[PDB]
Amino acid sequence: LTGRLMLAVGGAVLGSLQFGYNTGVINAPQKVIEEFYNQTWVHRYGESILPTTLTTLWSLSVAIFSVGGMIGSFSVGLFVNRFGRRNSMLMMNLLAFVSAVLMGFSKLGKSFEMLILGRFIIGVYCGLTTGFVPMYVGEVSPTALRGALGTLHQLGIVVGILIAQVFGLDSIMGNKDLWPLLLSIIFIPALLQCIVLPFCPESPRFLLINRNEENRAKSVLKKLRGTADVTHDLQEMKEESRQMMREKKVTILELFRSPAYRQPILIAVVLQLSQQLSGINAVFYYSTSIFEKAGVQQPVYATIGSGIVNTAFTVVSLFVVERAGRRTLHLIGLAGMAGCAILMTIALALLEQLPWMSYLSIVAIFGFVAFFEVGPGPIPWFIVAELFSQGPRPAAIAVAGFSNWTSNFIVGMCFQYVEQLCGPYVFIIFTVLLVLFFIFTYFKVPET
Ligand SMILES: CCCCCCCCCO[C@@H]1O[C@H](CO)[C@@H](O)[C@H](O)[C@H]1O
Ligand SMILES: CCCCCCCCCO[C@@H]1O[C@H](CO)[C@@H](O)[C@H](O)[C@H]1O
Ligand SMILES: [Cl-]
């Protein structure tokens, strides 16, 4: 709208791009980084790395990111209310630069420890970012536009996944020599945000409420909203303030202890479990590895195809979530992912008998990814926001986010263990989970 509003949102969702890039960058170059792990292991000890050790060490490098994300999401409120939304985003680029350097120089340092540490730290940054950007974009934008502009967060997530995937081709940075730059290149969005943010406005909601500077809030609203009559924005921020002061902010402990909040927080947690325990990130962490075992032509291209499908259905989901009930779209998603995970299993199990089953795995994953963005992707966050009023809602989101990261960790840390143990029957484990989550949602989850 305004122009200065574009700059503020644009500089904010760079971190959304960061969130997606760091999510799906470790997929395509698994084999070349695993080779480095082995090359390091023989350099230190003289023997080749054990295959199960390489599985654990590489799983940890993928998963330690989620351990960091749980901590950062948990620390969002600490930073956002003390330093502001804009200054916290600026400040936290320190985390991105520290992580780019640890991962960028891990090969020079011959240290998978550095890489794992960098993965942990860039995790903390992303858990903080996925709290910062929605708040800032939501508080900086007009009321009529704050809904549409909010979608740029998840748009930047999926676009950044796609960029990391494309950058993972052997033809560019996804190879033996340039994979440290592939992990390290996040400093370019980071440096770019450090330059833009000092020119972005602080949140008017933050200046008016958290710091009690009405006149500075008014001045920022004047720049964000070109017209001089910003009293409607001021009154709404005051009207939202009075409504937010009507309820006492429930703590996490109170949420679990109160029989009035024990059931709604159950629906919210299980719905976050249903998003990650669907195995969505088996795809975005390991699709290149699983496509290779599926005999796919060129796995990295099939991976990129999933990220293209992921972006297309994220864009498609934005126009469908407000045209159907949360309950229906979540079950449709869980059901589609269940069938695609079945097709994935029959293709994996009939590959030795039929070579063209490699193409069926590409179709299974494309639809597995497609059904996710329409249901299990966004909907767990819709119900939790509509299950709770302003009083308990912050604590409920914090608990939801901790359930998300925790089950993300489980998949990314354990998928390869149950892969070398179940073979072509790994995705039935996801079908069994999806089906349980399906009957749970059919019985326990109300429609909002
Ligand atoms: C480079 C590391 C990250 C730096 C982030 C902290 C910036 C500290 C200064 O903040 C600014 O102080 C002014 C004077 O009090 C306020 O007018 C303004 O609202 C506030 O934004
Ligand atoms: C302020 C926005 C609130 C609604 C957000 C809706 C979009 C949620 C998308 O889910 C994300 O999908 C990625 C793959 O696409 C996964 O890798 C990631 O683990 C998962 O969390
Ligand atoms: Cl701010």
Residue numbers in the entry: 8 to 455
Question: What's in the article?
Answer:
The human glucose transporters GLUT1 and GLUT3 have a central role in glucose uptake as canonical members of the Sugar Porter (SP) family. GLUTs belong to the Sugar Porter (SP) family, which as the largest branch of the Major Facilitator Superfamily (MFS), is found in all kingdoms of life. MFS proteins share a common fold comprising of 12 transmembrane helices (M1–M12) with a twofold pseudo-symmetry between the N-domain (M1-6) and the C-domain (M7-12). SP proteins alternate between inward facing and outward facing conformations with respect to the central substrate binding site, and the transition between these two states define sugar transport.
